[PDB]
Amino acid sequence: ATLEITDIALVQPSHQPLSNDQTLSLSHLDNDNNLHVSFRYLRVYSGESPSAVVSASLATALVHYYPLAGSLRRSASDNRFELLCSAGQSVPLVNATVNCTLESVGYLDGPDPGFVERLVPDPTREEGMVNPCILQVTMFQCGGWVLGASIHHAICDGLGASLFFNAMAELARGATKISIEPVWDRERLLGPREKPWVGAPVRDFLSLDKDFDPYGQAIGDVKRDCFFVTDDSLDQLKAQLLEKSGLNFTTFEALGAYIWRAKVRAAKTEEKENVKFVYSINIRRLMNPPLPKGYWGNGCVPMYAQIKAGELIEQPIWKTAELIKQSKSNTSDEYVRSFIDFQELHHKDGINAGTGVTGFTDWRYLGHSTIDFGWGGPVTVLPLSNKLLGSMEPCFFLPYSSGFKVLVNLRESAMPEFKEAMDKFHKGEFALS
Ligand SMILES: CC(C)(COP(=O)(O)OP(=O)(O)OC[C@H]1O[C@@H](n2cnc3c(N)ncnc32)[C@H](O)[C@@H]1OP(=O)(O)O)[C@@H](O)C(=O)NCCC(=O)NCCS
Ligand SMILES: [Ca+2]
């Protein structure tokens, strides 16, 4: 089962939005060192070819979204990213071909056929700044196909990228203009205060060490695996957590606690180490004033819960679920401004969440089914990046179309015991207490 790169196309805006070079600056959220990665993910789809249709809509989208065709540069000044856009810039589109069928490979929902990494560019740090947006279209023998995207995380979050992709789709679906015009305004809207201030809720999470690389820790090879989780399993868990605590818990709080406990037990973390649950909340709608609907920059911030590893592995699940629930209350306009001001004060002083960070991202929404180029909405979405939110072992909740998959990245050494913890879970043996 083999994949071949047939050609690479350089796709320019359909008309050139720029006369003159324009150097754009990024928000203080965009320049967090934790987002210095090329975020990689793929969408699987069941005549003009998808290559033509995708590339033509990319062209027209790039009129408004031309910064994706830019280059990221460190600025001599302060070593923050700026984005160099000139006329003639392009997005690369890799055109590929695999000699098999989507159904013969179970639409990529199952185990990796062994080319799944080859389905989306994997740029180096240097390459991924020259080209902060690379797309790939890979045809299967059934006329089924995959859209891969490598987007540098400094330019947008999942929601921002989704804005960009929904625009391409809607143009592919016949539209001649896009429904939501993207807004830059980045250093105006998410810039620091003149006299920076940082509250305890941000100071209690973060730490300075210029030598510490959160994505360079020596944990071994990190494996990817998905576990199917049933609505019934989740409702029995929720009902027992309620029996024992008197609280009702979201799936994210309940399953999140179980998964975090299992991960940490299984990595054999030492009782006294501080470990973290870190997730990404939307703040577009919570700022004062709220951010414009077309903001496609980073509009997310990390929230956290923290606890000694021994307490997590030995206290009841419902105490851990409650702690994750409490963390959602730190969420305020001020928390975000506290966060931005810490980046202002300490950007070059190695801001970090320390060791033992597990990252959690809910992808169950984000607007994937609306991304339809003429072959229906995606039948499977699969994010390949394992470097996120300060974690080398991030976990995603993937969407529906009875239940949904959880994707976990975990050090090879811990994966067996974890797989066993998910088998137990699938049988309702939750060992809550
Ligand atoms: C922080 C967060 C993950 C916590 O979610 P939560 O604990 O599930 O709590 P919420 O109040 O958001 O959701 C409450 C309930 O409504 C449901 N819900 C939320 N949005 C929904 C939607 N669009 N449609 C249907 N149900 C929805 C949830 O599934 C949950 O019920 P559940 O127990 O069945 O899962 C979530 O609120 C959030 O902010 N997500 C944004 C993440 C994001 O988009 N990141 C991308 C960055 S790269
Ligand atoms: Ca601190």
Numbering used by the authors: 2 to 47, 55 to 409, 420 to 451
The authors write:
In coumarin biosynthesis, a BAHD acyltransferase-family enzyme COSY was recently discovered to accelerate coumarin formation as the only known BAHD enzyme to catalyze an intramolecular acyl transfer reaction. To understand the mechanistic basis for the unconventional activity of COSY as a BAHD-family enzyme, we present several crystal structures of A. thaliana COSY (AtCOSY) in its apo and various ligand-bound forms. The AtCOSY active site is located at the interface between the two pseudo-symmetric domains, and features the conserved catalytic residues, His161 and Trp371, stemming from the N- and C-terminal domains, respectively.
We noticed that a single oxidation of Cys308 to sulfenic acid was present in the CoA-bound structure, suggesting that it may play a role as a redox-gate for the proper substrate entry. Moreover, based on our observation of Cys308 oxidation in the CoA-bound structure, we generated the C308A and C308S mutants, and assayed their activities in buffers containing a concentration gradient of hydrogen peroxide. Even so, varying redox environments had little effect on coumarin synthase activity for wild-type (WT), C308A, and C308S enzymes. Thus, C308 oxidation is likely a crystallography artifact in our solved structures. Guided by both the CoA-bound and scopoletin-bound AtCOSY structures, we modeled the trans-6OHFCoA substrate in the COSY active site. This reconstructed pose of trans-6OHFCoA indicates that residues Phe40, Tyr42, His161, Cys164, and Trp371 engage close contacts with the substrate, and are likely involved in specific substrate binding and catalysis. Indeed, we observed conformational differences of an active-site loop containing Tyr373 and Leu374 between the CoA-bound and scopoletin-bound AtCOSY structures. In the CoA-bound structure, Tyr373 exhibits π-π stacking interaction with the adenine portion of CoA causing Leu374 to shift towards C2 of 6OHFCoA, relative to its conformation in the scopoletin-bound structure. The Y373A and Y373F mutants exhibit WT-level coumarin synthase activities, whereas the L374A mutant shows a significant decrease in activity similar to that of the W371A mutant. These observations indicate that the π-π stacking interaction of Tyr373 with CoA does not contribute significantly to the coumarin synthase activity, while Leu374 on this dynamic loop region is likely involved in catalysis, albeit in a nonessential manner.
